[PDB]
Amino acid sequence: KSYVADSSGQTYYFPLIGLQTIDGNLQYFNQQGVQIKGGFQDVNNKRIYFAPNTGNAVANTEIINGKLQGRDANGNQVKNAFSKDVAGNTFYFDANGVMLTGLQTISGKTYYLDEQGHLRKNYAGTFNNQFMYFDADTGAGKTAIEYQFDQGL
């Protein structure tokens, strides 16, 4: 019941083979028992990305054909939602799976995605020909009209 790393740095967990979840983290080990790190591996019908150092399952994006696609932590492709990539960028993917670009209103709130499809947070701009500050938290557009100071004279 421990991990061990080789001279190279390949990692086993005593060995488990296939899809397993040691200490609540989803990992994939090859048929020879080595831990998959920093790559998409195919298990069952769902493609999963496993992180560079930890080897834990995480959301990631890859380029299928010429279009960016998004993959969640469970290996399912993302439709109608925000999903990250390993670097830390957030994207939004529509019902058809395709990444969105530019100014977008979803669920009654407005977000700004740059040309690369990166969700921009803590971003001020005249977007609708009217000022709009995009939240540091979720990137949702506020008008920055309400005073945020809480202390009257």
Partner 1 sequence: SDPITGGHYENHNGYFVYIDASGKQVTGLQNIDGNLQYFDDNGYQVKGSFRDVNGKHIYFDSVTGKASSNVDIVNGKAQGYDAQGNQLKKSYVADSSGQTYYFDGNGQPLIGLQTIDGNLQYFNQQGVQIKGGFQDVNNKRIYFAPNTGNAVANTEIINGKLQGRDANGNQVKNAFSKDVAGNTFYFDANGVMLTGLQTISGKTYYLDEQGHLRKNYAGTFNNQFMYFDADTGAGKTAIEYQFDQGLVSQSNENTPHNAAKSYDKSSFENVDGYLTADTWYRPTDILKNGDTWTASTETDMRPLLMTWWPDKQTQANYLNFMSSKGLGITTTYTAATSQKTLNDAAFVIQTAIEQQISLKKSTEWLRDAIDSFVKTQANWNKQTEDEAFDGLQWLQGGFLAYQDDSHRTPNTDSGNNRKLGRQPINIDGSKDTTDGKGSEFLLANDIDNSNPIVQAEQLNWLHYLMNFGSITGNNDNANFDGIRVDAVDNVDADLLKIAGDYFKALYGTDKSDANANKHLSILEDWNGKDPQYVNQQGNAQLTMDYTVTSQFGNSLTHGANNRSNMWYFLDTGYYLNGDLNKKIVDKNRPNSGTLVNRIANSGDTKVIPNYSFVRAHDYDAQDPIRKAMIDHGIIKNMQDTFTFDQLAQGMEFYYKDQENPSGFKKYNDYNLPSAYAMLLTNKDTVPRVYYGDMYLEGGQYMEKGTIYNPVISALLKARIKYVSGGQTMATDSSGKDLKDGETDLLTSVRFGKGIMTSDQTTTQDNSQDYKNQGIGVIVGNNPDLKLNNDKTITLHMGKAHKNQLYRALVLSNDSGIDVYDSDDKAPTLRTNDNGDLIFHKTNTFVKQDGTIINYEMKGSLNALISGYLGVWVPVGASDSQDARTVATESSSSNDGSVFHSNAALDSNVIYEGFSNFQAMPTSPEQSTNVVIATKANLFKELGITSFELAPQYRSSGDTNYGGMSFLDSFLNNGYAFTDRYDLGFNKADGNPNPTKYGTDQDLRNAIEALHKNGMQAIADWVPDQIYALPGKEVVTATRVDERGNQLKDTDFVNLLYVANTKSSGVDYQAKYGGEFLDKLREEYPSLFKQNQVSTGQPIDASTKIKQWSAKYMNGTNILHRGAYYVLKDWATNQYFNIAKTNEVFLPLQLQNKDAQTGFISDASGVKYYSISGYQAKDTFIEDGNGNWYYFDKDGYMVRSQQGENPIRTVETSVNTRNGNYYFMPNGVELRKGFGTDNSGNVYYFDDQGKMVRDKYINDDANNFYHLNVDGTMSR
Ligand X SMILES: OC[C@H]1O[C@H](OC[C@H]2O[C@H](O)[C@H](O)[C@@H](O)[C@@H]2O)[C@H](O)[C@@H](O)[C@@H]1O
Chain contacts with ligand X (rule: CB under 6 A): 51-54
Q: Which residue type occupies 27?
A: Q
| Interface region with partner 1, contact rule CB under 8 A, candidates 62-70, 77-85, 123-131, 143-151 | 77-85
Which of 118, 108, 26 lies closest to 70, judged by CA? 118
Residue 3 as a binder of ligand GLC (CB under 6 A): the answer is: yes
- How many angstroms separate the CA atoms of 88 and 105, rounded? 22
**Which of 54, 76, 80, 138 is close enough to bind ligand GLC by CB under 6 A?**
54
Shortest distance (Å) from residue 27 CB to partner 1: 14
Q: Are 51 and 38 in contact (CB under 8 A)?
A: yes
Q: Are 78 and 70 in contact (CB under 8 A)?
A: yes
Which of 49, 45, 43 lies closest to 70, judged by CA? 49
**Which of 26, 28, 49, 55 is close enough to bind ligand GLC by CB under 6 A?**
55
Interacting residues with partner 1 between 116 and 145 (CB under 8 A): 135, 137-138, 140
Interface contacts to partner 1, rule CB under 8 A: 8, 31, 42, 44, 51-54, 79-82, 88, 95, 107-109, 135, 137-138, 140
